[model samples]
Target chain A: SMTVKLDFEECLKDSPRFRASIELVEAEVSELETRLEKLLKLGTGLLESGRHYLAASRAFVVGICDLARLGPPEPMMAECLEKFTVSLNHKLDSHAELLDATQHTLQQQIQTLVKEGLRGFREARRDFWRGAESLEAALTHNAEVPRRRAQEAEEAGAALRTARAGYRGRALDYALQINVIEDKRKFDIMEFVLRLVEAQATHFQQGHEELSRLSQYRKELGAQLHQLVLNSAREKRDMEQRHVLLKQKELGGEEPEPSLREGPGGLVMEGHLFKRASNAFKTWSRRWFTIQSNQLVYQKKYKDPVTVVVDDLRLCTVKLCPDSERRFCFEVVSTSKSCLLQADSERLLQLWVSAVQSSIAS
Target chain B: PLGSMTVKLDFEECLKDSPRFRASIELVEAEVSELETRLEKLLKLGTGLLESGRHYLAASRAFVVGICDLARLGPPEPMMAECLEKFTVSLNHKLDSHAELLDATQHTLQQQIQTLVKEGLRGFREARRDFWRGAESLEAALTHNAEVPRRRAQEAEEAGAALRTARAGYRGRALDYALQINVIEDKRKFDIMEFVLRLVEAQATHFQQGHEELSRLSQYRKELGAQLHQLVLNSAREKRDMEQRHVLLKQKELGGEEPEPSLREGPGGLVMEGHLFKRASNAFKTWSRRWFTIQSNQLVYQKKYKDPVTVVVDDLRLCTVKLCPDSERRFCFEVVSTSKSCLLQADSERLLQLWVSAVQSSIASAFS
Candidate 1:
């Protein structure tokens, strides 16, 4: 005849203990959010730095150009080489900083979670055990002496039963709650890692691809430049020889109209061919310059490329000493000043250089 | 005192690092340790309850054995008969109550098991979601990275190919990856649906079990009450009838005359059966009262069942009642109450009254 007071309302009121547990969980959740924010900020900064570096490199390429009509390529080529090297160095420095920031942020976030967030979990577990122990004791006393202390025992048993039930329920609820949040954190971190890999891979692959294209173009340009040099040399020698022969014929008092100078006009026609070839080469070179410029944009705009081309075009055009044998030698003019080389037979080379330099400039 | 104990334990745990939390990786070991301890203690206590209940049942069985032996030895005295009937009724009631208690305890244990199972499933789901989320983020990052460089490379190729194709430009590789992304997104949708489907199926099964248990308990409780009424009334009535017969026989022997066979034909006649018949009638009255009380209790419990259980049942009824607008206020009230979150809260009082009225009507109809 024991009256059982299985009041659900009283049992629900006892849920304050669980509310405290949930509060601790919430605190842990906030901590996780802070860590995640830190990671995201670091990642964003890295990406931004890379983009700025790329933009600077692109600007540097453009800064070296002057008006196409002002035919001086040397000084501009000299400045371009210097500016490009600086940009490359800037990109490399930013890349190193990004990597350092990423690693440091991850380590800090992990450490913070270990130190602060772990305390809450420990407290929850402790409460669970305590509640279970209390419940077991009450249920045990009730079962042993139901006849003597029926009413009190029943009430005690009910309390114990509620506690056990609540504990189990909270365990599941908290377990679900914690795992969901933890899963989100895990997913965020994993995503961050994947993004990091993707960014780096993209940076490397783009740089590699750009380098390959630039190298190919450089080979073609090199062949044209070499051919221009050869053609200029051959035409100069023939002009000198034809001029000497004409002088000899004039000194002998003979008409020089039908002289060795006849083939010199053919050389002039060859100049036109050289001019056409120069235009073709310039057009080809410009295509690469645009592609390279785009590649550079990709590298610096997203993340710094692993290898940046130092456009030291000025170094390739360094002048010989005054007394040196190659002093009067027609040295390869920097693409910017190559137009000043009107006396040179290789007009196509100047055109190719000018086109690429203008393309990069724009 | 218990509150103070809990506070002290909580403070200690705050100092000591534990790991049983779902999210806290550092203290998971400690958390799991605490859970195991609790589970072990609860199982032990449950076992003890079972053992004690069995012992009580054995004692009742022993008492029954003694009564049977005494009954077989000789003609039972009236006092002995009363004791035997009381003992039988009490023992039966005790066994029935013990069985109900055992069933309640078993239900609690099963709920704990369900909690554990659900927790295990949630943990697995969380891990899986984390893995997939990570994978998705990685794929996005990789794709973005690959895209920029790949686009540049393609542009270079396009410039060369332009010499032959003239106006044709190569489309961006993003187009291909975008299509792949669409496919993956569709798959993700299906994955979510499948997960939800699993949860819904499990919930439905639990609801079905709850409904079955509720009805069974309600029916059993009513039967026990009826049995109690029947036993008490039948025993009292049989005792009275035997005493009356004894007095009638004594009177007949004293007169030394043949007993009138015609006494059976009239009301309150000498040979007419009265005490047993009156007792049986009393039992029927008690049984009716008991049935009413049990039915009322059933209605109260039904109204108090879990929110979802009540919601589903009420909604089913509401759907029908709404179709039959000409029906009584009880049906109309059910329809209106079905809109509430608790489902049965609005119309349960009316429904209970209606049930009582229906019982009255059924009894009247039966007599007519």
Candidate 2:
């Protein structure tokens, strides 16, 4: 494997680049923060709402049970009612537990992790700045002070040399000037500079160590955060899968397909009825009338093709004919046609009327 | 050039949005079979009642007729006969009228019952089931929604850490450059060294300011994360509280308990009571107004004046009094337990401070 390394001399020129990188990172951090905030809000809302709904469901179950008990006291009925209520309650309990796990345990854990991670970053940032500030102070004191002292030492040396040349014959003044210059030189500018450099080097070393430590902390925190995210994602995924399984279980295996047999089966009635054809002719016809799936089917005679498929029975109305002298006579009235039906007995007529009214209402 | 080689990481994209999470939530909401099952049972119950009612009515009719027969077997004295006949006639008349009334109403009654059993009850059941399914869906959506903040917080944390690292690297490199400059200036005149030192100091100051800004940003992000977590926890707490409230309301409605004020003692005793906005965890943005009563070590809150939700404050080891965080609200304090935390806001700073002190003292005393 080839390893690429950052050369120190090259990195020295990339000040603006580093600054821009920091800015980008800052922007990205801000964006991530915003996104997380939104996520938190959404998640919290979901969990809260879930609880509300679960409560609503629990209440509904209780209400229904109450209503069920309101009926006449019958042991078998009560037992059945109790069984259903208990079953529903059990289901509700499971749902509640699942919600609890999703909301409190998993979600709360993630929040805690993020919180701790952010706190770590804050600590690291503080440390980094503290180290940087210390190094800056050291540089100012060591570098700037050494430079001024060195300048003073040089100026003193030059003045001493000029005094020695001017007073070449004046040995006493020369010696005095030399003594003064030598005393000034006794400041030991080089040694002082060297000592300052040593101190600065120590500052740099300590500063770098702190910075390195801060870097390591950041790396660790980042890894931990990433690990947490993965854990949360996995937990959520598992919970969701479990929920789906529970749902399937609640539905009792695969969801039942829609059925074609969704209405009342065929209801048959045999009667002698007078059919009026086109307002001019009234023919006494014997027909078997059958109500099936909201449609009326009639046969003129037994084992014959269906004569009528009255699809719109809902539009038709039925009533007993008050004007008829016959004991069991009723009329079926529609917008386009009207027919009078006669039953064999009063009881039969009542049954027919009831059936027609129900079909129409339904 | 070395800086140019550092790859920029897209932290947000790396953490994908969870569709499975969303779907699961939706599935929970879609759940309504329990209600449907209950409705089916009701219909069966109703049908049974109708049948039993008819049988009882017929038996009663037979009993009345048998009584008339038994009366006919009695002695036939003129006075007795007349009286007996009169009584029989009256009874017969009443029974006949009743039978007639039943006969007359039977068609409509039968029609009505049939309609109710078939269309009326079925429609109602279906509609109710649909409504509950929708309700569950809303809840399920919310449940799933709780995950969002956690994930977001994680990503944000990672991003913040990454940013800190990057800034550190930049600062470290800047320091190294200053050191290198110092070495180069060591051989030069004092003036040049002074100038270089000034430059390095300015650069260091600039770096320090950047670091401070970064620190502030980090702090901000942390606060935001805390607020978000608080919101999530609050949601669960509020919801749990709401459920309690519902139970209480239901009990009260059913006359299970006397209608009394929510300002009651907890496991320990009455500590304090006041109005506060209990911040919801999930809905970090919204704070619900509640009447709070602190009793013993439990912090209980109620909606309006009903449905009291009690939070046990015994486990609360950390108590913080701070300004309204993550919002413009003025006065606020936060109480943190091992697993849960609540952000509470008050109308005034004095009240906020008072509650904070009270809660802190409560926690202290509880622990002690």
Candidate 3:
């Protein structure tokens, strides 16, 4: 029916059954001790995890507050986020308080049951075993006594009597301890576990109440959200129309809009243009040319020697050379030489002429 | 009136990438980064709470089972036995509901938000591209506007044409930019709220259910308190009652030791029994032989007869005997059973075979 029930008949005799019975009690309490420790470990772990959960959750709300400061543009949005932030911070406060309370109920009390009940029983088991073994050694000595050791047995029996007196007390005390621990085991474990359950019940109840009250804002927030989404859609439609109108305007006008950038120090327009060399053969080569600082200069490579075609902007003149073999040819005349160049297209030909004319006046 | 976070764009100001709009862009980027970072943390840590919580429940289950094992064997007063088994069921349900809550939480927290942030941040990333492109194109338009013709109808038409085109380029980019901005702004507003509101609702539902479940066990819990109190009171009373034996048993305990006579046998029968050194350990204590005795056809030994003794040889009828002369000791002999055997010793060579055939004589009588 049970693990071990030592009859007084056996205990009084210091019998093997009593030793066997005590062993059973010791082993179970050891198992219970480790199991209680595991509960404390996990319960502490579970609570600590929530400690950081609040950190992460608090960090999450701050970002929402950050986004709200920019406010996409109103108080309706900003105000709602502010309310959400405030409530969550309060929720974290409640979270922290609840955890400490649960810790005391679940972990602290279980540890007390272990230290006070289980540990004390372990000490008593040690003392009782000590007394039994001493008395047992004495009995063994007396039983196998030699005649030379016969008077030794007479004195030994009296010593054994004294030890037995202690052992019987120790043995009864141990049995009493087992029954007490057994009684403690049933109710104490349940009280701790029940405390754990009640804490969770409290957790859920408060969390539910907080959320139930919070959801009251849900419809109001939803109404505002719908309005804003529609507002964005209406804005989207206007932009879509604007983009289409511009698309048509682009289609009606032009093609090959040349990439141009302003050159340095009053230089207006620059791109690759074909320049005719001064050699008698009249060979042509493409060069990077620029109009800057009121001068017409061309260079072959980045560090190559620059050939100045017209340096005196005040005295220079420019003209379209319609008679040239190229369709888009032009000339820039200086006192020393007139340079002939061909533009890639008529658009560029006009652009070069305008820039040189403007530089001459400058 | 302002809708949320935009201001009306002045065309020239948009062209310049004005200080105010520049400030707005930086802040938007920062907020987006933070929003993304914060969501990432929430996802991981909330899952941490759930994972830890789940293991905590498992650890709790181990603890409840620990009690059941202890109560089942260690000793259960009848009331405690029923009360403890009742807790096993109650605590398991406690584990079950918390599991449901955690499962629901992980569903909302990790999976649901994973999609929300992943897709939503991708949208923000795309919005960054179009938005910056708008600002870049608008800034370039200002330079293009400077090229309107100043120095023929044809040359003028080309220059004027480029200006109009750049203006249209600016307008189109601005439109695309503002569209993305508005969409993102609108997205941030309720999409986030919708996710968390659902979470709140989930928690609320779990909370209500969890609270309601524990509430149903009120009667059982109340009965537990009464039973638990009764156990402690009874154990104290029982502890006192068990202690009374200390005095009564001591008076009775004045009785001691068996009378020395029997020499392992008595007047009724000539069964052989006596002490012999049995080497059973690694030390000098091996020289000590306990009282080896036999009665009613079983060979046994005892620290004392009052103590528990072990039966060494099962029955005289089933065993065969032989001398142990091969052993280091001269008088040692062996007893053999078909399955197992024990070695024995005598005071001299004579008693070795004397007991060996004495045991075989009993074996022969069994055949008669």
**Which candidate has the highest DockQ of all?**
3
- DockQ of prediction 2: 0.00
Q: Mark the 10 consecutive residues where model 2 chain A has the least summed lDDT.
A: A1-10
Question: What is the per-candidate TM-score for chain B?
Answer: 0.28, 0.25, 0.64
| Chain B TM-score against the true chain B, candidate 1 | 0.28
Model 3, span B1-368: residue lDDT tens: 45343443233434333344455666556666766776676676666666666766666666567546644644445654665666677667767876787788777665556876877667446656766675565335433332232334366456556655654555455555555655655566666665556555555565566566555555566776687677668867876777776456766653443212122343223365555556542344334566665555566788764567677766556777666536644456677775446665544334455556655665554334
Instruction: For all candidates, state DockQ relative to the true structure.
Output: 0.01, 0.00, 0.15
TM-score: model 3, chain A:
0.62
The TM-score that candidate 1 achieves is: 0.21
* Residues A25-144, model 1: lDDT tens digits: 556555555644454444444444434534443342232222111212333224433433344454456556555655554455544544554555556556655765765464343333
How does model 2 fare in lDDT? 0.42
Error of 2 at B105 (Å): 34
How much of the true A–B contact set does each candidate keep?
0.00, 0.00, 0.25
Candidate order, TM-score descending: 3, 2, 1
